[PDB]
Amino acid sequence: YRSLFQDLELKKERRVILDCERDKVNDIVDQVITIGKHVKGYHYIIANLGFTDGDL
Amino acid sequence: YRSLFQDLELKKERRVILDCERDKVNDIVDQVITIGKHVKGYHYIIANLGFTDGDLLKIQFGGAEVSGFQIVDYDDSLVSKFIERWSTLEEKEYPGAHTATIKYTSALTYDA
Numbered sequence: 219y220r221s222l223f224q225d226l227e228l229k230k231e232r233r234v235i236l237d238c239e240r241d242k243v244n245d246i247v248d249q250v251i252t253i254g255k256h257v258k259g260y261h262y263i264i265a266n267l268g269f270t271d272g273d274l
Numbered sequence: 275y276r277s278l279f280q281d282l283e284l285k286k287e288r289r290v291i292l293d294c295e296r297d298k299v300n301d302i303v304d305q306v307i308t309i310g311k312h313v314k315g316y317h318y319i320i321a322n323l324g325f326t327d328g329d330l331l332k333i334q335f336g337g338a339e340v341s342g343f344q345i346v347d348y349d350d351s352l353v354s355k356f357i358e359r360w361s362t363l364e365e366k367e368y369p370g371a372h373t374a375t376i377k378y379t380s381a382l383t384y385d386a
Contacts, residue, residue, distance in 0.1 A: 253337075256310055
């Protein structure tokens with residue numbers, strides 16, 4: 219995942235729409251937390267009906 | 275703390291030297307994690323002898339550069355002879371011992 223978002227920084231993306239399970243959503247966001255792409259400038263969209271189910 | 279670093283963003287500081295206990299260091303860094311000031315552009319310095327005692331994996335890959343001081347270097351074989359005994363110590367008999375590393379306060383207690 220640290221390889222993955224670095225490859226997203228090859229395009230320097232700020233706009234990532236996730237399509238994962240509620241566990242796999244929370245696992246990757248914790249990796250976003252680890253690298254700090256939850257800061258201003260980024261935008262994320264969670265593509266499920268359980269937007270309130272995750273850890274916000 | 276979210277009020278505090280926002281007040282640091284009134285000056286827009288990037289250079290914060292912490293002076294806290296090992297728990298209170300880790301508590302505030304987790305608030306830095308919560309706001310994301312562990313990213314590149316920031317620099318932090320931990321002002322204790324236990325720089326290796328804290329949790330460095332939480333902010334190793336964020337971007338800020340973290341510095342500190344260590345009096346108990348684990349690369350010494352004399353320290354490594356202690357560590358090879360330290361991890362094999364019973365936690366139930368010696369509480370806090372069955373670990374990979376040691377606090378410097380516990381090391382200086384053994385040094386005393």
